[model samples]
Target: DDDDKKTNWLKRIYRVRPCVKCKVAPRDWKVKNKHLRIYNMCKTCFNNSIDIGDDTYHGHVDWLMYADS
Candidate 1:
């Protein structure tokens, strides 16, 4: 009168998105992506790409002009 025809699938389980950077580790449950100002969402797909003072982007402007020759 034991062993039933049911399993964990009938109850519930974990189903989350795979973290890119944290593949070897884990995610923050919710990745917060800000628009402006400053913020680092859930240690997930939100850590990088800080505009301002970032001279890397300048390459497409001034310096490229001189190299145009």
Candidate 2:
């Protein structure tokens, strides 16, 4: 069940972060015409400093995604 849970969580993150080619919503109303630069990673790259499974991280689950370096 943990694997399923992780996959589901990853899907949720992917909706927002997607890939490096993903654009910022609303701001990216038109494909290729948008002015925003794509980011290599999500905000978590800068915001996540704690472990996802930790009890203290309950409120910050938004930063926890299945990623590889």
Candidate 3:
């Protein structure tokens, strides 16, 4: 049940949010990259960069900024 809730939470956020750096539309191919100095990012920007850590989420409200763009 706990895992299911987290999965749902992650899906709900990732489903509509775009790339933080490029503002690309949300898609199934999107990725979550954790950087030591920044927040999560989509796969496109991640691939074009380096030294990003694990994948994670901050919050839905934080991601809403990208969705609005």
Candidate 4:
């Protein structure tokens, strides 16, 4: 039964990770340049990008910065 399953309460869940490409949860992974930091992408969004065929690529990041207290 679902209620009978043992759970580990000690484990900590991290913050929600956003997809590098879609700014949302990643649907699929494509390994490109394994040596460098891996990039997580959403499949539907990527395919949509191809469909639009902008012929231009854009790179952007929405990051959080902190200062010493």
Off by over 4 Å in 3: 27-39, 46-69
lDDT of 2 by residue, 1-69 (tens): 565675676555546654232244311111232222333434453233233433332122233323331
Which candidate leads the pack in lDDT? 3
Residue 32, model 2: Cα distance from true site in angstroms: 29
Over the full model, what C-alpha lDDT does candidate 4 score relative to the true structure? 0.37
Please name the candidate that would achieve the greatest TM-score relative to the true structure.
Answer: 3
**TM-score, model 3 to reference:** 0.36
Alpha-carbon lDDT of model 2: 0.36
Model 4 clash pairs are none
lDDT score for residue 55 of model 3: 38
Candidate 3 per-residue lDDT, tens place, 1-69, comes to 565565566567666667665667452242334211223556556555444643343322322222222
The TM-score ranking, best first, is 3, 4, 2, 1
TM-score-better candidate, 1 vs 2: 2
Model 2: colliding residue pairs: none
C-alpha RMSD of candidate 3: 11.0
Give candidate 2's total backbone clashes. 0
TM-score quality measure for candidate 1: 0.21
TM-score of each: 0.21, 0.29, 0.36, 0.34
Better of 2 and 4 by lDDT: 4
